[PDB]
Amino acid sequence: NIAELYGKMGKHSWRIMDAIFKNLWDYEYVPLQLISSHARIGEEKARNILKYLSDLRVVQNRQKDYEGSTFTFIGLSLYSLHRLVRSGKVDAIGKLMGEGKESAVFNCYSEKFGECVVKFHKVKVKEHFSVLAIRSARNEFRALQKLQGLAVPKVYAWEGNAVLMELIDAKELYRVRVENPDEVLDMILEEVAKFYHRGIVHGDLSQYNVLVSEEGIWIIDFPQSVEVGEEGWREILERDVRNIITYFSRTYRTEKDINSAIDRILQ
């Protein structure tokens, strides 16, 4: 369906989407007049385009205070895919691999990079969808770049809410029973130490974000990552270590002291 949606888009549609994208920095709902002026498409025609894009679930239009438009998740993903296609990084989008509360992950093929996944991202006052989703994608991309050569996917590109990376032929740890859990846990903790040496804390280390095969382990899912030195980095690192050791304790009864494991990494 994402491919079908893509095929409904003409040059004028992409220009309208570009105009929203380029004005997200200072509006959630970009005013019609700005979309029109940026796209160099007359207001009545721009309005007609935005109505059709809303019909296709690509934009959400509001009128409470003024006529304004923003991306839906589908629309931001579609636009980001377009940027990837136009930069020659992706040739065809393929089948959905899976979707949940934080992302939708699709298979795709790149003549340059081979079989890939593209991951579309979904998500100081504690109580701007697009701006936050783009920030999430950019963070994952930057973390993956910094960690290249370690046990993570090769990363190829980032546009909008999309990150293009290597497909890993491995399953989530959560789904795999290992017969050497103590060694597996040690390999994970060694990778945590290597990330830390590179100034990166994962931020969501879990049984759902470690992939395993007979061949080894990979770690994925970096939008929550922080740099060492950022507020709370140490407690976030401790959490990653505590959570993965706790998983192994509950599942395998491995005996690994959390305090010593943290202290070993940190020294």
Ligand X SMILES: Nc1ncnc2c1ncn2[C@@H]1O[C@H](COP(=O)(O)OP(=O)(O)O)[C@@H](O)[C@H]1O
Annotated binding site: 97-105, 119, 166-172, 208-209, 221
Per-residue x/- marks for ligand X, 138-177, CB under 6 A? ---------------x-----------xxxx---x-----
Nearer to ligand X, 32 or 219 (CB): 219
- By CB under 6 A, name the one of 16, 35, 201, 220 that touches ligand X: 220
Residue 153: helix, strand or coil by DSSP? coil
Q: How far is CA 99 from CA 65, 104, 157, in A?
A: 34, 4, 20
Q: Report if residue 221 touches Mn ion, rule: CB under 5 A.
A: yes
Query: DSSP readout, 200-254?
Result: EE-S--STTSEEEETTEEEE---TT-EETTSTTHHHHHHHHHHHHHHHHHHHH--
The catalytic residues are 204
CA separation for the pair 267, 256 (Å, rounded): 18
Residue closest to 188 by CA, chosen among 171, 165, 204, 205: 205
Nearest distance in Å: CB 227, ligand X:
19
* Residues contacting residue 19 through CB under 8 Å, at least 6 positions apart: 30, 34, 35, 36, 38, 39
Nearest distance in Å: CB 207, ligand X:
10
- By CB under 6 A, name the one of 208, 242, 251, 256 that touches ligand X: 208
**Among 10-18, 116-124, 188-196, 219-227, the segment contacting Mn ion (CB under 5 A):** 219-227
Per-residue x/- marks for Mn ion, 174-213, CB under 5 A? ----------------------------------xx----
**Among 75-83, 112-120, 218-226, 247-255, the segment contacting Mn ion (CB under 5 A):** 218-226
- By CB under 6 A, name the one of 74, 97, 131, 228 that touches ligand X: 97
Q: After which residues is the chain broken (C to N over 2.5 A)?
A: 123, 127
- Which residues of this chain interact with Mn ion, rule CB under 5 A? 208-209, 221
